[PDB]
Amino acid sequence: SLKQRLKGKEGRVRGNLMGKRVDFSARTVITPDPNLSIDQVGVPRSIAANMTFAEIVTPFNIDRLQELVRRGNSQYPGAKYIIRDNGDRIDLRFHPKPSDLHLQTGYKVERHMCDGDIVIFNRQPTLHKMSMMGHRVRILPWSTFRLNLSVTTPYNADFDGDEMNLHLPQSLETRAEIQELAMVPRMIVTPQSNRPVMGIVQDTLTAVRKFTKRDVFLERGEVMNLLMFLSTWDGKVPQPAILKPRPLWTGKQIFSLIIPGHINCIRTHSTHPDDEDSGPYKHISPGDTKVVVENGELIMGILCKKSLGTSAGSLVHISYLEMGHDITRLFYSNIQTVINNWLLIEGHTIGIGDSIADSKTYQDIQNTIKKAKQDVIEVIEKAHNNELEPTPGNTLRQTFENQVNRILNDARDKTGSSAQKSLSEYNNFKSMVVSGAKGSKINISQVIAVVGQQNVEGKRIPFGFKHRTLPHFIKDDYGPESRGFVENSYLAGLTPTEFFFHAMGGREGLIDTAVKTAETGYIQRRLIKSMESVMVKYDATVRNSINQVVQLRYGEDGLAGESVEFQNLATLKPSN
Amino acid sequence: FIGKIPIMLRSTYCLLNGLTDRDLCELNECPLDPGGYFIINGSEKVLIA
Amino acid sequence: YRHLALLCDTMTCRGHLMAITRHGVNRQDTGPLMKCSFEETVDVLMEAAAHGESDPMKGVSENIMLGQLAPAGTGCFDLLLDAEKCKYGMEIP
Amino acid sequence: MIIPVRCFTCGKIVGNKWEAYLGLLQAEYTEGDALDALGLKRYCCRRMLLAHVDLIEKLLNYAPLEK
Amino acid sequence: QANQKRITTPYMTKYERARVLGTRALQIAMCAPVMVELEGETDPLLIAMKELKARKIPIIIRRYLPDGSYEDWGVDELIISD
Amino acid sequence: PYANQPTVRITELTDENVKFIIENTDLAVANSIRRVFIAEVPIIAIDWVQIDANSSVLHDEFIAHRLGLIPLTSDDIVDKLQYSRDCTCEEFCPECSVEFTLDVRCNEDQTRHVTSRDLISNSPRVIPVTSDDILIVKLRKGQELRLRAYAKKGFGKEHAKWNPTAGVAFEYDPDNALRHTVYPKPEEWPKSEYSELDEDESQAPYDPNGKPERFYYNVESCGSLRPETIVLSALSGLKKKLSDLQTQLSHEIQSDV
Amino acid sequence: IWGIGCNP
Amino acid sequence: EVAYCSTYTHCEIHPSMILGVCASIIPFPDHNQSPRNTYQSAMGKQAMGVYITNFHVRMDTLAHVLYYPQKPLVTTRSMEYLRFRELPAGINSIVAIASYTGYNQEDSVIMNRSAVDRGFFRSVFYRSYKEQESKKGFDQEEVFEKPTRETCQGMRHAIYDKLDDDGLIAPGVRVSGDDVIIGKTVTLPENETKRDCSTFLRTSETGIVDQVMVTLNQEGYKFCKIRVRSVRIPQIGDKFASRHGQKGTCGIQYRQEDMPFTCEGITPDIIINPHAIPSRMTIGHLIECLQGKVSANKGEIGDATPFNDAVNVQKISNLLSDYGYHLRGNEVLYNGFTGRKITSQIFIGPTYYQRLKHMVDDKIHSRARGPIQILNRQPMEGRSRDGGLRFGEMERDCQIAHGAAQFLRERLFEASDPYQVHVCNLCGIMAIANTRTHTYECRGCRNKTQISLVRMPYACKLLFQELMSMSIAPRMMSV
Amino acid sequence: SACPLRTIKRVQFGVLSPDELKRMSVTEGGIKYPETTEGGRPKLGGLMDPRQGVIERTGRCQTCAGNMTECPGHFGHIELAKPVFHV
Amino acid sequence: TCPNHPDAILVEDYRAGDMICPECGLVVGDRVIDVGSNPLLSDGD
Amino acid sequence: MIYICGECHTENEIKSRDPIRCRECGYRIMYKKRTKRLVVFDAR
Amino acid sequence: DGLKYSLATGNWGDQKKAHQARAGVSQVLNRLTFASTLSHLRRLNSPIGRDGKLAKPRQLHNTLWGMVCPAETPEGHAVGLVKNLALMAYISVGSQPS
Amino acid sequence: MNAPPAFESFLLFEGEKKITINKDTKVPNACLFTINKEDHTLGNIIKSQLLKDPQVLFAGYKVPHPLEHKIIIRVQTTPDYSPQEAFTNAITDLISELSLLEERFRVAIKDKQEG
Ligand SMILES: CO[C@@H]1[C@H](O)[C@H](n2cnc3c(=O)nc(N)[nH]c32)O[C@H]1COP(=O)(O)OP(=O)(O)OP(=O)(O)O
Ligand SMILES: [Mg+2]
Ligand SMILES: [Zn+2]
Ligand SMILES: [Zn+2]
Ligand SMILES: [Zn+2]
Ligand SMILES: [Zn+2]
Ligand SMILES: [Zn+2]
Ligand SMILES: [Zn+2]
């Protein structure tokens, strides 16, 4: 019915008016490309050949467009159509008369997409504003869109079968709009959290931590090669940190050439000892933490997620705030290229040697588990004798579960800490966790020491069978193993009952992901529809479509969210 | 005659039942094929439990 | 804080708590087409037709539906040609 | 379906060794001993012969499309 | 409105810069005269950028205040956001 | 500012293997020689197949691929042969290619193994390394395979079918003395076959002045070329590449000035 | 899969 | 023992039987995270291998068969009853877990191009097209014949030379996109000759015809099935996954010279990023690499049953130490480009890698001024129909956030469904307009002078007309 | 084309008058025939009216020379014998 | 019906859906393919 | 216009609009024979 | 025709009446790989609606030990609502109680 | 479908120059050499030999993109030396090294056989 057509989603009101299928759009699998800049995207030649951007013939560009017209559709840098002044369209594929090929001012030649053509890149779902960013086009000879790795974080895209949509603006006006509003370098900093959206990620973060250690010393030829990939190099080789006996540069010395202009920043490495700041060696840091950049030169410190990641006050954030968006784009790209070429010399890997720990550490983990199981048994015996006293506001079952969970969690965390103590400097799990590129201390602990308690619906594994978790366990068994505690690590391998309980926990995780996607989508749509028309007028009042004043000044101070920074008042706290 | 009943492949009432692997090859049917599906209108349909 | 405060100010601007739902949002005296895009659709249109409501066409969604330039950014202002400046300068072509 | 010429990783011709490998297995050599006798030394080459599944015999069981 | 009593921001907004550069570039593509001497620049958008730097774009921006009045700021009068 | 004078000792020389040590050479030169072994030594291999009848279970392009991978003896004729692009004649001629023809039909009840021996070449020098045999396909009774193929000169940079070597073993500094690789636990790592250290010491003491030298090689051949000939041809081809670069560079230098 | 306070 | 239960009434035959068919192919399942086993269960259904031994006889749509399937080097005991050895899906691949050039970052994979040239992960794609000669029409007969442009009033300019006399292309003829596989003609009733009814190849198929069959279907009409074969060499978009839930596309392909090489000369066939392992905690992958190294050297297929208690990492490590390798499986690698030893020692070992059905060639689509729908006069939908990608409501919200009003306008009006209507000034209802006659008149007012042209999306015109059919009057007034 | 280009500044919604429906509809006398086909294809005063819209992608509707693109379609009216509530 | 070519046969096209004069390439009809879109039993019902 | 037969593998020439049945076996599943024109396969 | 229709369409019922018909039965066998064929044949489908996001029918239950594969479930909108039998599981054919 | 032909990696298409020499404005006595249809093989040897020259202050090679086939070599020499001269001399030295290596490998071959 008419009401059925209009009412539902995919109806005329929403499925055909608010959103609709569009021309001049392309889609293909995305794959990485560290060599492309932040703003560049790699487009296959077939997608580039099908999509055409109409160019008006001017006295300036008549020769170039004439050559494109002569090439035709077959040769790649060609023109698919000619649009005359009358509006007549001459498709060049079917034979055009040699008279028709002649061009005059006012004709519109529809050239194939060429290098440097601004396009809009999208990945569904388009949750935030950074999910649609303008990319320059670079044509490369395979059939996948290729984008830089730093740009993956705004899109929330990884290269495991993902796909992205390419929209080509067809007019100079809309092309200028994209170029000056939505290009990738212009949206490095999000107004949502006044932090940079994009940061150094994956191999480059892991390797920048290693590159910036005090230990790293580079010889002459390696410095030559690293400087070769630096786009903004002045052409002057820095004086090596160690002139004699053999000229040897340092990783920080080369990274100082990457840092844009003169940027001053102080951040702390992840492994910074808390006592260091108060005690001596505060400035001459024993562990080479406390990153300090003065006059755009890395005086000291080990770079990590905190210094080069997506956080307020990062080196990239200070670069965007101080140097500008263009120099910051160059900064991102140069970090990636130089560090990735050093990683060929140094290399990274993950093996079983990383998971395995010392025999003493394994014995310590086993002892912690033994005494934890004994403690749980003691609590159970107290409960059976009714000696246990209920916690206020909780039933005896609830307080028994609380105490048992506390004991098991303390054992789990202590075993994790023992495993993390065992890790050597060379351990690669530790490299990735410390750099912040991937992983967490929890994952290391589960790999090496103890997987941990399996909880479903916020409780230990429930009694699915009559008064027992599995048929193999005795009825009314509240012990650690029966209710889901997985003593073995992933490296050690789970026992079969622990395997089933672990499967139950993982299933809860999967279900939570599936449900959260839908519910969050609905919430986001409702918020947008409620606040879509609110904007800052030229009075600087924030008014809706009805012109009712939502706010007299935007944010009550009339400032935009990206420019602002965290600061301390310093008059508030001190005593009189 | 009251009608025709579709036959699940390699069940007792199928032609392939109790045939040696060489004979299955002679009929151009794979010895390793599990069976358990109906061939309705030329496509193999599986009844999900 | 700007993004939180704006939502709180839109919900409590009218003086009654405006839920972000079909009821609260559609009850506000916006344009009928803008209400039509959110949830209720046809029913909103029927009511607007019955009462002779007129769409001001100041909203973003209403202009998007009719294909006109939105009143959003890059559409808030109208450019005009400056004849006197055109006359001045070096007109090479 | 058939033994690949030229082991993928390095390129040594391994296509001539399948029938000899099967024959050595019939001669009660262990698989490792047969691989050693055939001259396959790197684990990349041994992977080819050890993990190959000869389906072409099963395909040859079917009568030819044209006689 | 009168030329006096202009209350809008003197700085050119980002959206105004986008639309002014795009519109001027579209005019340049249609063979409009170019105020700024071009140093071998053929792309219309780049020529428009040069003109914007020289503040010679022949466009006056009309900013609509919410009360219905309008203020006409010439592109030259506005301070470039850059 | 002049080239080092290298030396060579050949420890092992067999029909399918050459082990040699290049000394007093830079690492870049040694690695480039290793690279030229793999990718820039010309060999003759099948690149054009016209299949007249293929009743085998394997489809036609499968057969073409397998035929291409079959090594062909190219010891001396490869230098005489010209690349198909260089040859003036249209398509292929005896100067620019070698014609192989294969006709096999299985009329016996027993399965017929089509082998490389069934490939017949018009030129005696180029033969599929037969003088077991590589199995192209197996044929049931009533199945026939007839095809005609031409072989062209090329090198491994185009396709791996033109790769002369099976595995090129490159190793320098067998006992870690320049500390190019930093072992987390030096003791666990197995000693190199070329290592000169006693069993007690896992690594040699670090030598700051030392630079990579005395590179160890082990080149294995597919039989397409003699293993000695692979090394000699690689050296000659790299020399030719450098000489072409020098000619073009002289042209550019003169033209600019 | 870790604990009651962590993740499943 | 220490008394736990003395009244056991039954015993499990083997705990590994709790897993299903797809989960039984995972080696060392107990050493993986649970979501990763769940993901591998779904990826294993999509892998490429010989699906059935009678695949030559069968004419199925979308059949992929791998050139050189290999059975796993590290296999579970329950795989034997799944017949995975008989019909394997995947190739054991020398895999290095390393960061080489940044092209393996995220989940992508660097593949060896020389190995790909030698037949590594090469597959064939068969597509079958079916057509039926239907004479059921009263005066319509869908005869099989080669259409002729002069004889048939309805025809298309795609190539018709391939078709033989019967109207079916002979097997062994190459077919490029937009070629006529089957030529069919419907005789046209002469109300007062031929509307073309040929079937055309899916774009970019670029295959060779394998088998052409002519039969009579269930209805008794002549039935023709044509199977087109396309070889599929792996590219830099194809998706490869291991048995431990690690999926990823091919970042780039380097030749054997460029790939890093061990001292023995072994270059990894696949290089995966070390960053995939830690967050996902798929340690089964690492243990499988170690056991595969030991198995390849020893010559016996490794046992990876889930719960064994006789196979430990330490035992596998000692076994590997016996064969002359580092006990944890690491190997000293050399950089292919420069020859210098990589300072870190890279973990190299054979690992069963699968090739999934998702390939970039099937997933690449581009649209520019294509056909439009009838109802909405908007671009079509789908890759087969050359449809444009949808600019959803979330996308328009992002563009509103940007402030790109004109890009939003182009994308939502000008690119999709531009249209013009004529609207009476006095009454907002649309008015009849004859452009050729140049007379524009509005019914209901008897007014001709006051009519204005309005540009609106065709979808908006349809919305307004559907409102009018519901007796709602959307009077659009320019004033 | 001669008509000036205008942009809608206000959309007025109202219930369509039955008299206005009668005047506006191109069909005169209503849709008298349930059948869509007369004289073979076109049925005047039927559901598929040539004056109502363009048919077959090549014809022109009677009211204007639409050619399947220019014509926006034209409404018709059915005069119900006895009135019916609108749902 | 190419205006410059009296009695000219216009070749159909599938890529954009238009009939094009083959001797000059003029596009006659812009998007005039669109989608381009049991009578035996009983009759009209 | 020579069709190979599935059941007995005997080529039978069939004219246009002729029933698809193989003489000497009666089977109704025919295969068109391989084309005479030859296709160049790169060994690559 | 009734049996053939119900198998081909996937709707369990009569042609005229689709109100009580249950869709999702009788799917086309997957032939991508032998593993896919085997898993498709050994598959269970819970009748709970996919649209409902209530999580109780989706969670793995303790009683599925050895009857249903814990790992193998589709990830997406049907997590836990489609299940595969374990290797040794055998559904009872049925017998008379006399 | 968009795969480049294999011969494109080493074959100059018509109108392409094997070497193009462009000076570097940033620093004195520096030239930037672009070699088309060449890979790390030639680049590494040339860079190493240039680094051995005492008068060469800077020498490095860069492949701008692995999918494309091009080498960029930057050479900076001291005054009284030209970057082009350094490049030519490097090539002569590499050729001399390879010729000496060929002679010695042939002698080693002849000695290993029948000796
Ligand atoms: C990271 O978030 C993404 C996005 O949110 C997007 N996405 C995916 N599915 C849906 C869906 O159904 N509905 C909506 N709206 N969005 C969806 O996909 C999510 C992750 O899913 P995953 O958790 O499987 O990603 P791995 O962690 O698995 O990545 P491996 O290691 O395989 O490469
Ligand atoms: Mg992903
Ligand atoms: Zn090998
Ligand atoms: Zn010739
Ligand atoms: Zn009117
Ligand atoms: Zn009309
Ligand atoms: Zn014409
Ligand atoms: Zn017959």
GROMACS .gro file of N, CA and C and ligand atoms in nm, chain K residues 5-10 12 22-27 30, ligand 8:
model
   43
 1748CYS      N    1   2.843  -3.813  -2.686
 1748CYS     CA    2   2.741  -3.869  -2.599
 1748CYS      C    3   2.801  -3.908  -2.464
 1749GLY      N    4   2.726  -3.884  -2.357
 1749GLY     CA    5   2.775  -3.919  -2.225
 1749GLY      C    6   2.784  -4.069  -2.203
 1750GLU      N    7   2.682  -4.143  -2.246
 1750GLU     CA    8   2.673  -4.284  -2.208
 1750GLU      C    9   2.770  -4.370  -2.289
 1751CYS      N   10   2.773  -4.354  -2.421
 1751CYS     CA   11   2.853  -4.440  -2.506
 1751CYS      C   12   2.967  -4.369  -2.577
 1752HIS      N   13   2.985  -4.239  -2.555
 1752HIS     CA   14   3.099  -4.163  -2.607
 1752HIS      C   15   3.114  -4.177  -2.758
 1753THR      N   16   3.002  -4.171  -2.830
 1753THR     CA   17   3.004  -4.176  -2.976
 1753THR      C   18   2.951  -4.045  -3.031
 1755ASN      N   19   2.773  -3.790  -3.260
 1755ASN     CA   20   2.659  -3.793  -3.351
 1755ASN      C   21   2.630  -3.652  -3.398
 1765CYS      N   22   2.119  -3.963  -2.870
 1765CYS     CA   23   2.232  -4.027  -2.935
 1765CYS      C   24   2.187  -4.159  -2.997
 1766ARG      N   25   2.209  -4.173  -3.128
 1766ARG     CA   26   2.193  -4.303  -3.190
 1766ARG      C   27   2.292  -4.402  -3.130
 1767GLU      N   28   2.252  -4.529  -3.125
 1767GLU     CA   29   2.326  -4.643  -3.073
 1767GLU      C   30   2.324  -4.651  -2.921
 1768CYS      N   31   2.279  -4.547  -2.850
 1768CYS     CA   32   2.255  -4.562  -2.707
 1768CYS      C   33   2.123  -4.504  -2.658
 1769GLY      N   34   2.067  -4.402  -2.722
 1769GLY     CA   35   1.944  -4.339  -2.675
 1769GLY      C   36   1.959  -4.241  -2.561
 1770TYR      N   37   2.080  -4.216  -2.512
 1770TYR     CA   38   2.099  -4.121  -2.403
 1770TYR      C   39   2.066  -3.980  -2.449
 1773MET      N   40   2.411  -3.490  -2.414
 1773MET     CA   41   2.515  -3.474  -2.514
 1773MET      C   42   2.610  -3.363  -2.474
 2008ZN      ZN   43   2.552  -4.242  -2.714
   0.00000   0.00000   0.00000
